[PDB]
Design an enzyme around this catalytic site. Structure first.
Site, mmCIF file in Angstrom:
data_model
loop_
_atom_site.group_PDB
_atom_site.id
_atom_site.type_symbol
_atom_site.label_atom_id
_atom_site.label_comp_id
_atom_site.label_asym_id
_atom_site.label_seq_id
_atom_site.Cartn_x
_atom_site.Cartn_y
_atom_site.Cartn_z
ATOM 1 N N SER A 126 3.338 -6.952 -8.834
ATOM 2 C CA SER A 126 2.000 -7.011 -7.898
ATOM 3 C C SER A 126 1.284 -6.016 -8.370
ATOM 4 C CB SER A 126 2.112 -7.879 -6.910
ATOM 5 O OG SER A 126 1.017 -8.743 -6.222
ATOM 6 N N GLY A 127 0.076 -6.217 -8.918
ATOM 7 C CA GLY A 127 -0.620 -5.429 -7.894
ATOM 8 C C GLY A 127 -0.644 -3.594 -8.915
ATOM 9 N N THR A 131 -3.623 -7.403 -15.060
ATOM 10 C CA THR A 131 -4.910 -8.302 -15.496
ATOM 11 C C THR A 131 -5.681 -7.537 -16.644
ATOM 12 O OG1 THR A 131 -3.988 -9.994 -13.808
ATOM 13 C CG2 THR A 131 -6.060 -9.707 -14.819
ATOM 14 N N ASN A 176 -1.752 -8.116 -3.499
ATOM 15 C CA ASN A 176 -3.561 -7.052 -4.829
ATOM 16 C C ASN A 176 -4.490 -7.740 -3.815
ATOM 17 O OD1 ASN A 176 -4.359 -7.324 -6.714
ATOM 18 N ND2 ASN A 176 -3.667 -8.333 -7.823
ATOM 19 N N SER A 179 -4.421 -10.807 -6.846
ATOM 20 C CA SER A 179 -3.760 -11.394 -7.512
ATOM 21 C C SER A 179 -3.596 -12.968 -8.186
ATOM 22 C CB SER A 179 -2.648 -11.580 -6.542
ATOM 23 O OG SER A 179 -0.797 -12.017 -7.004
ATOM 24 N N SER A 180 -2.988 -12.694 -10.046
ATOM 25 C CA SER A 180 -3.067 -14.006 -10.557
ATOM 26 C C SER A 180 -2.481 -14.466 -9.877
ATOM 27 C CB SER A 180 -2.689 -13.228 -11.642
ATOM 28 O OG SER A 180 -3.126 -12.136 -12.229
ATOM 29 N N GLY A 399 3.370 -10.610 -11.785
ATOM 30 C CA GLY A 399 3.677 -9.888 -10.881
ATOM 31 C C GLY A 399 4.938 -10.097 -10.378
ATOM 32 N N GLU A 401 6.675 -9.680 -6.925
ATOM 33 C CA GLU A 401 6.815 -10.059 -5.554
ATOM 34 C C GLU A 401 7.707 -10.016 -4.340
ATOM 35 O OE1 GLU A 401 3.481 -12.220 -5.760
ATOM 36 O OE2 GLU A 401 4.327 -13.526 -4.723
HETATM 37 N N1 LIG Z 1 -7.290 0.715 -15.760
HETATM 38 C C1 LIG Z 1 -7.065 0.354 -14.245
HETATM 39 N N2 LIG Z 1 -8.863 0.836 -13.320
HETATM 40 C C2 LIG Z 1 -8.796 1.020 -12.384
HETATM 41 N N3 LIG Z 1 -8.533 -0.353 -11.937
HETATM 42 C C3 LIG Z 1 -7.299 -0.609 -11.901
HETATM 43 C C4 LIG Z 1 -7.188 -0.979 -13.112
HETATM 44 N N4 LIG Z 1 -5.149 -1.255 -13.762
HETATM 45 C C5 LIG Z 1 -5.844 -1.635 -12.425
HETATM 46 N N5 LIG Z 1 -6.785 -1.288 -11.246
HETATM 47 C C6 LIG Z 1 -6.857 -2.289 -10.449
HETATM 48 O O1 LIG Z 1 -5.915 -2.433 -8.877
HETATM 49 C C7 LIG Z 1 -6.146 -3.823 -8.642
HETATM 50 C C8 LIG Z 1 -4.363 -4.656 -8.801
HETATM 51 O O2 LIG Z 1 -4.643 -4.625 -10.915
HETATM 52 P P1 LIG Z 1 -4.891 -5.804 -11.692
HETATM 53 O O3 LIG Z 1 -5.063 -5.698 -12.553
HETATM 54 O O4 LIG Z 1 -5.179 -7.140 -11.214
HETATM 55 O O5 LIG Z 1 -2.431 -5.876 -11.637
HETATM 56 P P2 LIG Z 1 -1.439 -7.152 -12.151
HETATM 57 O O6 LIG Z 1 -1.970 -8.440 -11.751
HETATM 58 O O7 LIG Z 1 -0.209 -6.395 -12.277
HETATM 59 O O8 LIG Z 1 -1.257 -8.094 -10.164
HETATM 60 C C9 LIG Z 1 -7.125 -4.331 -9.703
HETATM 61 O O9 LIG Z 1 -7.608 -5.376 -9.074
HETATM 62 C C10 LIG Z 1 -7.960 -3.189 -9.973
HETATM 63 O O10 LIG Z 1 -8.913 -2.874 -8.367
HETATM 64 O O1 VO4 Z 2 -0.542 -9.208 -8.482
HETATM 65 V V1 VO4 Z 2 -0.134 -10.111 -10.305
HETATM 66 O O2 VO4 Z 2 0.723 -9.118 -11.223
HETATM 67 O O3 VO4 Z 2 0.414 -11.614 -9.413
HETATM 68 O O4 VO4 Z 2 -1.283 -10.318 -10.379
HETATM 69 MG MG LIG Z 3 -2.533 -10.335 -12.698
#
Ligand SMILES: Nc1ncnc2c1ncn2[C@@H]1O[C@H](COP(=O)(O)OP(=O)(O)O)[C@@H](O)[C@H]1O
Ligand code: VO4
Ligand SMILES: [Mg+2]
Length: 691
Positions: A126-127, A131, A176, A179-180, A399, A401
């Site tokens: 997560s985070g 995405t 996050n 979070s998706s 992700g 969690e």
């Molecule tokens: N390459 C990046 N550049 C800048 N900020 C990023 C980047 N990747 C992630 N973030 C930050 O981290 C947060 C969580 O990343 P995200 O891609 O939503 O995570 P996940 O989908 O793995 O849970 C985003 O909303 C953003 O604020």
């Molecule tokens: O925070 V996620 O990896 O569920 O998008």
């Molecule tokens: Mg995501």
């Protein structure tokens, strides 16, 4: 300066390892190396300090042999500009700094070169950054397509698909802010010649429970807060609602505002996306109306007439109009549901608890079915009917969690992450070694210890956590304690990954040693969450509804006359078999710290991720094996220039011996020359030195 035998890495107690169980430091020549497979020394602190060093200079991408590692910068960086997109095009992996744009372009390069479908598989907890990276792959492809050689172009619609989806399917959690709360596989279709032709999205398991329930430190889906921001006061009039999230119970059990998220500008981005996507004002307002109706649905009170009767019709009335239904019919369906008696019916009775449950389920069903319809609608406009031959799929799952309270939702999420890790393991360690065996290469199979088969078998295989939950559903007398009892009778002491819980912090019923750690699960209400039953009397009214969206959301519905876990396993297996028929491109995202601090790197957290992902193992198979291999024909067609002095194989044997290279750096296979790391790059470099 440097000391070949005195500069070492020692095991720090708080910072994993520290610059000084004694491992040699790598020379300064290799500082911030773009490919960690080219490090002379390969141990845990060698990889940790190269990643920490590159992250210090904001270089978040780094190669690990055939795959890439990206560490969340938590801050916008000027590396995703359209100028950078154009520069990355056509470039080989070794002739540009590591980047998500390079993974995308090289997947495109392999697609036309091999005539094969590709897939960009992004892993992380997560985070971690999944995405964001997913959006940059789509961004690279759309920007590249839009430059070549109302509703907008295919390229804009593809980009705008994600803001429309994040409002309804993303939410703020403790790990996050965006979070998706659903899985996503996006296919980007191309023709035989490489021109972008179409695109589609398939979504998986939207977290229904979030719609009507929130934990202390988390919000409901973004959309609610965006509407209640009042940046569009017309919408509040339309939905007959106040401007306070705390007025609506379904959406205010946890937090209501997020510091990193401006809900007012987000609603504008959300609405703009539906415009570019080709939606109509009736389409937009129908989804807005339904979102509003779900809030009013949660505010309806009930009371004892053991049988319930409406405790005031004020909230029931508002939601009945927004849904295009009769308020008296809606309330009589909830309290007195019809039971079929041949070509007639008899109503059954419900108590306040039973009506409250039924209402919760209906709002979840409407919401999830609205999201499905929305995805189908986005897909309908992304369908260009232009000739397609290949595709590049992008996988963005929810992700790994671990919350203070882990339920069915967490099990399905973590299960998939365990499944996807096994995909990496099988591809990188099992399939790779079987390719060396296939081509008659001299090789002895290495056991890298990368095999979560026991943990996957515990969850999915018959008499496993999900199989037990499915059987116990089909028993009317089954309770949460009978399921708890069945889990323990079959698995305590028998399945090594199933342990007793490690309990202030909420009460857990069992432990699960996942690839990324022990997760404590609470099995309360799992039987009901898996069944997903609905008040068919209210669903019937939905079918006849005067609002076209609500009527079509429930037109395809099967009555009383299947479970969540069976469908999730079915889809997961369908997905894994379909990914098996593509060339995969692994991107391993790493969360640098718990507290969302940009540029800050928690060493014990990063090292945990690198260990459970298999980054060191995945680097070693690239060093010990042969990561590059060209068919004898494709090798003469490209590298005959080097020494032009009838068979494709015999000619390649004489060519490589006539060149000034290490004759251990290559091996001869049945149909391909297998090269060791970096030799291919030198041969490609030498082709320019005489071209
Ligand atoms: N390459 C990046 N550049 C800048 N900020 C990023 C980047 N990747 C992630 N973030 C930050 O981290 C947060 C969580 O990343 P995200 O891609 O939503 O995570 P996940 O989908 O793995 O849970 C985003 O909303 C953003 O604020
Ligand atoms: O925070 V996620 O990896 O569920 O998008
Ligand atoms: Mg995501």
């Amino acid at each position: 300066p440097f000391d070949l035998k005195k500069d070492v890495f020692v095991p720090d107690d708080k910072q994993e390892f520290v610059k000084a169980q004694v491992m040699q430091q790598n020379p300064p020549k290799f500082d911030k190396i773009e490919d960690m497979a080219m490090l002379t020394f390969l141990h845990e602190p060698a990889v940790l300090y190269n990643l920490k060093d590159r992250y210090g200079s904001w270089m978040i991408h780094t190669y690990s042999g055939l795959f890439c590692v990206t560490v969340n910068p938590y801050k916008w960086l000027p590396v995703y500009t359209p100028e950078v997109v154009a520069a990355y095009r056509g470039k080989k992996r070794s002739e540009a700094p590591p980047h998500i744009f390079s993974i995308s372009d090289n997947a495109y390069q392999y697609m036309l070169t091999d005539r094969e479908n590709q897939s960009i598989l992004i892993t992380g907890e997560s985070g971690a950054g999944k995405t964001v990276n997913t959006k940059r792959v789509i961004q690279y492809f759309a920007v590249i397509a839009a430059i070549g050689d109302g509703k907008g172009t295919l390229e804009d619609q593809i980009i705008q698909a994600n803001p429309a989806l994040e409002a309804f399917g993303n939410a703020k959690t403790v790990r996050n802010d965006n979070s998706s709360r659903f899985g996503k596989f996006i296919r980007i279709h191309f023709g035989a010649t490489g021109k972008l032709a179409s695109a589609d999205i398939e979504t998986y398991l939207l977290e229904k429970s979030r719609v009507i329930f929130q934990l202390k430190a988390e919000r409901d889906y973004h959309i609610f807060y965006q509407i209640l921001s009042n940046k569009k006061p017309e919408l509040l009039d339309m939905l007959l609602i106040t401007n306070n999230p705390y007025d609506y119970a379904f959406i205010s059990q946890g937090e209501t505002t997020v510091a990193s998220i401006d809900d007012a500008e987000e609603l504008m981005a959300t609405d703009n996306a539906f415009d570019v996507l080709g939606f109509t004002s009736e389409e937009k307002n129908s989804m807005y109306k339904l979102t509003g109706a779900i809030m009013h649905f949660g505010n309806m009170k009930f009371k004892l007439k053991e049988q319930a009767e409406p405790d005031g019709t004020e909230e029931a009335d508002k939601s009945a109009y927004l849904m295009g239904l009769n308020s008296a019919d809606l309330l009589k369906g909830l309290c007195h549901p019809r039971v079929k008696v041949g070509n007639e019916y008899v109503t059954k009775g419900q108590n306040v608890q039973q009506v409250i449950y039924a209402t919760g389920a209906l709002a979840k069903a409407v919401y999830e079915r609205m999201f499905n319809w929305m995805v189908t609608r986005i897909n309908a406009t992304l369908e260009t009917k232009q000739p397609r031959q290949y595709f590049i799929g992008v996988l963005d799952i929810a992700g790994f969690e671990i919350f203070d309270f882990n339920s069915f939702e967490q099990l399905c999420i973590n299960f998939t992450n365990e499944k996807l890790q096994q995909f990496f393991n099988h591809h990188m360690f099992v399939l790779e070694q079987e390719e060396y065996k296939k081509e008659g290469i001299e090789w002895t199979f290495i056991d890298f210890g990368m095999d979560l088969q026991a943990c996957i078998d515990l969850i999915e295989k018959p008499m496993g956590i999900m199989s037990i939950l499915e059987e116990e559903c089909m028993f009317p007398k089954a309770t949460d304690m009978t399921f708890k009892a069945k889990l323990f009778d079959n698995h305590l002491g028998k399945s090594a990954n199933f342990q007793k819980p490690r309990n202030g912090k909420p009460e857990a019923h069992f432990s699960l040693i996942h690839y990324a750690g022990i997760v404590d699960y609470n099995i309360i209400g799992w039987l009901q969450k898996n069944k997903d039953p609905l008040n068919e009397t209210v669903v019937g009214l939905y079918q006849k509804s005067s609002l076209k969206l609500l009527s079509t959301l429930f037109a395809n519905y099967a009555g009383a006359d299947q479970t969540v876990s069976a469908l999730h396993r079915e889809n997961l297996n369908k997905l894994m078999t379909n990914l098996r028929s593509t060339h995969p491109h692994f991107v391993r995202c790493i969360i640098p710290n718990e507290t969302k601090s940009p540029g800050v790197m928690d060493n014990p957290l990063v090292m945990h991720q690198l260990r459970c992902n298999g980054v060191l193992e995945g680097i070693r198979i690239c060093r010990k094996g042969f990561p590059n291999r060209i068919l004898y024909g494709d090798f003469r067609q490209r590298y005959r220039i080097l020494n032009p002095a009838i068979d494709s194989r015999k000619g390649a044997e004489k060519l490589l011996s006539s060149l000034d290279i290490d004759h251990n750096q290559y091996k001869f296979g049945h149909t391909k020359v297998f090269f060791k790391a970096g030799l291919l790059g030198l041969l490609e470099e030498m082709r320019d030195e005489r071209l």
